[PDB]
From Swiss-Prot, chains A, C:
It is found in: Cell membrane. Changing residue 148 to A: Little effect on EPO binding. Residues 116-213 form the Fibronectin type-III domain. A motif (WSXWS motif) lies at residues 202-206. Receptor for erythropoietin, which mediates erythropoietin-induced erythroblast proliferation and differentiation. Upon EPO stimulation, EPOR dimerizes triggering the JAK2/STAT5 signaling cascade. In some cell types, can also activate STAT1 and STAT3. May also activate the LYN tyrosine kinase. This is Erythropoietin receptor. Keywords: Cell membrane, Congenital erythrocytosis, Disease variant, Disulfide bond, Glycoprotein, Isopeptide bond, Membrane, Phosphoprotein, Receptor, Secreted, Signal, Transmembrane, Transmembrane helix, Ubl conjugation. The keyword Signal applies. Erythroid cells and erythroid progenitor cells. Changing residue 90 to A: Little effect on EPO binding. GO terms for cellular component: external side of plasma membrane; extracellular region; nuclear speck; plasma membrane. Changing residue 83 to A: Little effect on EPO binding. It comes from Homo sapiens (Human). The chain holds residues 32 to 244 of 508 of the full protein.
UniProtKB/Swiss-Prot annotation, chain B:
It comes from Homo sapiens. Disulfide bonds join 7-161, 29-33. One of its GO terms (biological process) is erythrocyte maturation. Hormone involved in the regulation of erythrocyte proliferation and differentiation and the maintenance of a physiological level of circulating erythrocyte mass. Binds to EPOR leading to EPOR dimerization and JAK2 activation thereby activating specific downstream effectors, including STAT1 and STAT3. Changing residue 150 to Q: In DBAL; loss of support of normal erythroid expansion or differentiation; reduced ability to promote EPOR dimer formation upon binding, resulting in reduced JAK2 activation and decreased STAT1 and STAT3 phosphorylation; mild decrease in affinity for EPOR; no effect on STAT5A phosphorylation. It comes from the Eukaryota. This is Erythropoietin. Glycans are attached at residues 24, 38, 83, 126. Keywords: Congenital erythrocytosis, Disease variant, Disulfide bond, Erythrocyte maturation, Glycoprotein, Hormone, Pharmaceutical, Secreted, Signal. SUPFAM superfamilies: 4-helical cytokines. Produced by kidney or liver of adult mammals and by liver of fetal or neonatal mammals. Pfam families: EPO_TPO.
């Protein structure tokens, strides 16, 4: 599961080796943690329990995996019926001995890691000569009206060293009118949910697009 | 000021569109969608003439309690579905989204003050339910799910959100 | 049946031969039709039955009046007590002979027909957005937040077919582009209650406004 693997890598980086959880399409949730590969007693080594506010404590079958680092990641994918946004989700991981390892309380809508935007295209505006950037939001994702973006624009005489433009949520277009003439530029977009209704971490950058001014 | 999260149309709309798809998809049900029993559901009709004339607090009563009954109806549908190797492959996800969505809406409504208002406006003895609507197919269950959220729920939420200070 | 007649006319003009039902204030409902069959068709020529889901069958008082070109228009003004939305409404029209004329199921909230929007104001833009259009929702009409619009751009005859633009619900202004210069344009705007909560039909066009480019 490349996408999940690569995403769990971002969180491992940005966040803690603690219990990390993230939703991609708001109708899902996976929590996981990595740990110094041991011996036997894999997923059995622990019990992952969760409880959505006002409901009974449930268990979530754990899975073990070979993290492309040399360690082992334990992960659980919440049953879809329990992936409710805006409701306190208490998570708890217990080791074989019965001792608590992790204790978190999250809100699914605040841990979203979106797939990267798709279909990035760059065109020279209508008689303005400006660059108009258009793209599609992460596929199969709801609440697109709440997805803001960040554009990376780089290029120049072997001096292409970026610049970042923040795009309003719901907007999938960006107008650049101060770009240097006769210059081959390269742009890319990344997505993330807008606060305060939502929260999360930057998505992967979209495939790039080059344009000559 | 906008009573947070549910007062954001797009936030509530996510569920209304989910319900529409659920309802739409269950129209091609056939004989593969019986609940094999009568599941009590709320009444979703709204008489706009009577609706805008009744004490606003009563809107709260109707929606909060109706939603509660709805949640129970869907939960029952979920367990009825877990049992058997019965047909209709599409049913599962729509039910999981409904259970999930109804759970979010319930939390969302309370923050809006729906549960508080509903309990007080309903703290005096009244006349027997005198109604009792039911469904025996997932089709009616989902149609009711959509009509309720897009109906009195939306209506109640729209008015309640316009609440500054006076 | 004043502004009513026009509305009735608007729906018939676009849907002849079938049973058309519509509501203007969600507190009302009128189902009707025109007969290209006269003489012998008395007031008891048809029986109009309806049933709100989980409600007992009921009969509606029929009405008749000379119409169009040698035709008659039958109508039923649904008692307000039974004009409830968000619930299936089964309708059945039967000839006095027991013959089935029409049969339908509709949702009152899905057959709304509003008054046309007003105060349209077409203006030019010192930008590539040629003409900026702004308007007002149909007068006396709540829930404005979910009313959808459609603007029409009329050319300077001789040819100039059309240009239909749909305006997202709630939004009462737009930027028109690709407006050829040296041309007199006329723009009008339509309106209709938007899904998923409502539905219905496009209102009559608003009074037009012209502008030269």
């Amino acid at each position: 599961d490349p996408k999940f693997e690569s995403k769990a890598a971002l969180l491992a980086a940005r966040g803690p080796e603690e219990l990390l959880c993230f939703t991609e399409r708001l109708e899902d949730l996976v929590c996981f943690w990595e740990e110094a590969a041991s011996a036997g007693v894999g997923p059995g080594q622990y019990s992952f329990s969760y409880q959505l506010e006002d409901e009974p404590w449930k268990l979530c079958r754990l899975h073990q995996a070979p993290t492309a680092r040399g360690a082992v990641r334990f992960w659980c994918s919440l049953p879809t019926a329990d992936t409710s946004s805006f409701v306190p989700l208490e998570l708890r991981v217990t080791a074989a001995s019965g001792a608590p390892r992790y204790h978190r309380v999250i809100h699914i809508n605040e841990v979203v890691l979106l797939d990267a935007p798709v279909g990035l295209v760059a065109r020279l505006a209508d008689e303005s000569g400006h660059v108009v950037l258009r793209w599609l939001p992460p596929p199969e994702t709801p609440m697109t009206s709440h997805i803001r973006y960040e554009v990376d624009v780089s290029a120049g005489q072997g001096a292409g060293s970026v610049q970042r433009v923040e795009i309003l949520e719901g907007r999938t277009e960006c107008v650049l009118s101060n770009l240097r003439g006769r210059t081959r530029y390269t742009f890319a977009v990344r997505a993330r949910m807008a606060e305060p209704s939502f929260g999360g971490f930057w998505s992967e950058w979209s495939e790039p697009v080059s344009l000559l001014t | 000021a906008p009573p947070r999260l549910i007062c954001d149309s797009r936030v509530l709309e996510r569920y209304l569109l989910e319900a529409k798809e659920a309802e739409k998809i269950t129209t091609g049900c056939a004989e593969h969608c019986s609940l094999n029993e009568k599941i009590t559901v709320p009444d979703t009709k709204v008489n706009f003439y009577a609706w805008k004339r009744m004490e606003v607090g009563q809107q709260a009563v109707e929606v909060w309690q109706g939603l509660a009954l709805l949640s129970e109806a869907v939960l029952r549908g979920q367990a009825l579905l877990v049992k058997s190797s019965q047909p209709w492959e599409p049913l599962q996800l729509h039910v999981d989204k409904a259970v999930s969505g109804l759970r979010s809406l319930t939390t969302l409504l309370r923050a809006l003050g729906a549960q508080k208002e509903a309990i007080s406006n309903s703290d005096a003895a009244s006349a027997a339910p005198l109604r009792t609507i039911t469904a025996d197919t997932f089709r009616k269950l989902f149609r009711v799910y959509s009509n309720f959220l897009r109906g009195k729920l939306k209506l109640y939420t729209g008015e309640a959100c316009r609440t500054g200070d006076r």
